[PDB]
Amino acid sequence: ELRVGLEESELWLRFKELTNEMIVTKNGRRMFPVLKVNVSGLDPNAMYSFLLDFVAADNHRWKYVNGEWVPGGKPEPQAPSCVYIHPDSPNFGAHWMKAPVSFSKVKLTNKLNGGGQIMLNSLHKYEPRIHIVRVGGPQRMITSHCFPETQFIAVTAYQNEEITALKIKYN
Ligand SMILES: CN(C)C(=O)N1CCOC[C@]12CCOC2
């Protein structure tokens, strides 16, 4: 059975309980914390690519009002984000299962940009999601996993200083 688990969930939960924020910039900003995923139950000898994308958790624009995050009243459809390919991809089941799969190099932007960077809408709430794509084999296969613990609002600067403090304390 293919098992997908979040490394350092206790750390992510500290951020989640304050409402997590991730900086987006024109040129793209790396995430902290970094999404790290424990994977077991792969075929050590089969071939897989690991894909990361961001689901809009709701259709609303958020705003920090009197020290609290609040949704707008005017929802809009949120197009799914573009996918980031883990740079170790493609690779053998054994490679992926030998240490936590770390997305340390993904960069979050607010501008349609060249290559690599994933564009997110500022002040939208997002839920990180991976796809494990079996490649090369005759039977293509995808398994998807969401990480509720890693939800965040995309921001151009931190609103909640409690988040600023946690980011510095644990970097
Ligand atoms: C680019 N890359 C390293 C890939 O893994 N490729 C190859 C080209 O695009 C499709 C996929 C994405 C996952 O399935 C195969």
Resolution (A): 2.0
Among protein residues, the one whose CA lies closest to atom 11 of ligand 1: 49
Among protein residues, the one whose CA lies closest to atom 9 of ligand 1: 85
Q: How far is the CA of 50 from the centre of ligand 1 (A)?
A: 9
Is 83 in contact with 55 (CB distance < 8 Å)? no
Q: How far is the CA of 49 from the centre of ligand 1 (A)?
A: 7
The experimental method is X-ray
Q: Out of 101, 133, 140, give the residue to mutate to test ligand 1, the one with the largest number of ligand atoms within 8 Å of its CB.
A: 133
Q: Where are the domains of the chain?
A: 1-171
Is 52 in contact with 117 (CB distance < 8 Å)? no
Fold of 1-171: Immunoglobulin-like (2.60.40)
d(CA 36, CA 38): 7
> Ligand 1 atom closest to Cα of 49?
5
Residue whose entry in the numeric block shows the structure tokens 């995309």: 154
Handedness of CA 82, 49, 108, 77 (dihedral sign): positive
114: buried, middle or exposed (CB in 10 Å: 19+, 13-18, 0-12)? exposed
d(CA 52, CA 27): 19
Single-letter residue type at 19: T
Among protein residues, the one whose CA lies closest to atom 1 of ligand 1: 85
